């Protein structure tokens, strides 16, 4: 019979669920080797993660997956599995199950197909338009903000300077908050939020965010880069 | 007091590693709102983390983060946590301490000057540098790729081959013996810690990414791969 590693159990996954690999062998008996899991993230290279030799019960994870990640094996079934938990955007990858040649063999002769694991929405989606706008000093600056779903007037403005945190300008859509200079302004128009500088002051020129605090979890708008018209800056 | 959120904890960790923020709080009794953590990747959007409510402990995480974080608080000392297990390189951002402005007032009007925390890649683990990246060659070139270890690993190197969608195929072992059914222009040689393969003809089904890997610890470490692509055309 021939030598086979076939994968199993991939799809996609919300970020922090869980999901179980399996492996089945044939050819060969799994009780007699090590059985090694190898993934590799899309258009990147190569990383263990676990072995197990099912014969003396031994296993090893690496340190970016211990305590997550829980390697088992069945060999009644001549199986082996691979229990992912709170997985992560950086778990995306293709997981291959291996194993070494055995007795002094120590290189992996027989690699799996593979299988992918994608992991990922209910989630209030804020969408800012534009990106990004330049400007000179004393014009009119409008950014708009769309709300996937209705949010009220549940909505902030928030403005960041490059190194600093975000600062308030405007809560519940076009109230302006306390200390914060009279040319900005908001309003709403259904799911359609708009921020306003009436006449654009050199320290204005930052990032701007959108954020709605309708529901939770709060989410915010990709956010505006308002610059000076030219290049560079 | 003015209102004040003062962060303090990040710092260098390497993929895997744990991580303790702190979010000392004055001018406010934390008891009183919620306290929040929010991130930002370096140069992406803001992110919100997690959220506590110190009065009866209630919290809620974004799913990017459940089971990996846990925010905490202790109001003896008007201060929160965030405990960051199982960090990774998604984790790397600046966290920013934040507050909801209380009852009825749902914005977060007071942030801190935020904490980096960066997850690195420079590690214990012994490092396959290959060169080059990336190599256009023509059919019946001769081909070298080499790789340098980071500290001895005897002749426990192994090559292999990937081809697009497919997995990786056991191509050299120990070094230099060529593996059975593997055509005879591949060889491994060993100099010190530099191991080189090499392709005496490269042949049109040559072409693919090659990885070498150590085992001679535990874990095996894999080079970053060489993709040779091909110089020409024969349609």
């Known amino acids: 019979m021939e030598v086979q590693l076939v994968e199993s159990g991939g799809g996609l996954v919300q970020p922090g669920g869980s999901l179980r690999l399996s492996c089945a062998a044939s050819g060969f008996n799994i009780k007699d080797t090590y059985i090694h899991w190898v993934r590799q993230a899309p258009g990147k290279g190569l990383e263990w993660?676990?072995?197990?030799?099912?014969?003396?019960?031994?296993?090893?994870?690496?340190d970016s997956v211990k305590g997550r990640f829980t390697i088992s094996a069945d060999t009644s079934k001549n199986t082996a599995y691979l229990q992912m938990n709170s997985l992560t955007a950086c778990d995306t990858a293709v997981?291959?199950?291996?194993?070494?040649?055995?007795?002094?063999?120590?290189?992996?002769?027989?690699?799996?197909?593979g299988t992918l694991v994608t992991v990922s929405g209910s989630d209030i989606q804020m969408t800012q338009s534009p990106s990004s706008l330049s400007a000179s000093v004393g014009d009119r600056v409008t950014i708009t903000c769309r709300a996937s779903?209705?949010?009220?007037?549940?909505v902030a403005w928030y403005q960041q300077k490059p190194g600093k945190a975000p600062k308030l300008l405007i809560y519940s859509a076009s109230f302006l908050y306390s200390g914060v200079p009279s040319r900005f302004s908001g309003s709403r128009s259904g799911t359609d939020f708009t921020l306003t500088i009436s006449s654009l002051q050199p320290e204005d020129f930052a990032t701007y965010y959108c954020q709605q605090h309708y529901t939770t979890p709060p989410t915010f708008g990709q956010g505006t880069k308002v610059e000076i018209k030219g290049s560079h800056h | 007091m003015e209102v004040q959120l003062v962060e303090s904890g990040g710092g260098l960790v390497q993929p895997g590693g744990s991580l303790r923020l702190s979010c000392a709080a004055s001018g406010f009794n934390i008891k009183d709102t919620y306290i929040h953590w929010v991130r930002q990747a370096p140069g992406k959007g803001l992110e919100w983390v997690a959220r506590?409510?110190?009065?009866?402990?209630?919290?809620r995480y974004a799913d990017s983060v459940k089971g990996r974080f846990t925010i905490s608080a202790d109001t003896s000392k008007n201060t929160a946590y965030l405990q960051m297990n199982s960090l990774t390189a998604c984790d790397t951002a600046v966290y920013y301490c934040?507050?909801?402005?209380?009852?009825?007032?749902?914005?977060?009007?007071?942030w801190g000057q935020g904490t980096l925390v960066t997850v690195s890649s420079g590690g214990s683990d012994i490092q396959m540098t290959q060169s080059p990246s990336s190599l256009s060659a023509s059919v019946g070139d001769r081909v070298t790729i080499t790789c340098?270890?980071?500290?001895?690993?005897?002749?426990?190197?192994?090559?292999y081959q990937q081809k697009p969608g497919k997995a990786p195929k056991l191509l050299i072992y120990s070094a230099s013996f060529l593996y059975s059914g593997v055509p005879s222009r591949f060889s491994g040689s060993r100099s010190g810690t530099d191991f080189t393969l090499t392709i005496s003809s490269l042949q049109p089904e040559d072409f693919a990414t090659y990885y070498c890997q150590q085992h001679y610890t535990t874990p095996p470490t894999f080079g970053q791969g060489t993709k040779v692509e091909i110089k020409g055309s024969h349609h």
């Open positions: 506590i409510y110190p009065t009866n402990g209630y919290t």
């Open positions: 779903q209705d949010v009220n007037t549940a």
């Open positions: 934040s507050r909801w402005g209380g009852d009825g007032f749902y914005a977060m009007d007071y």
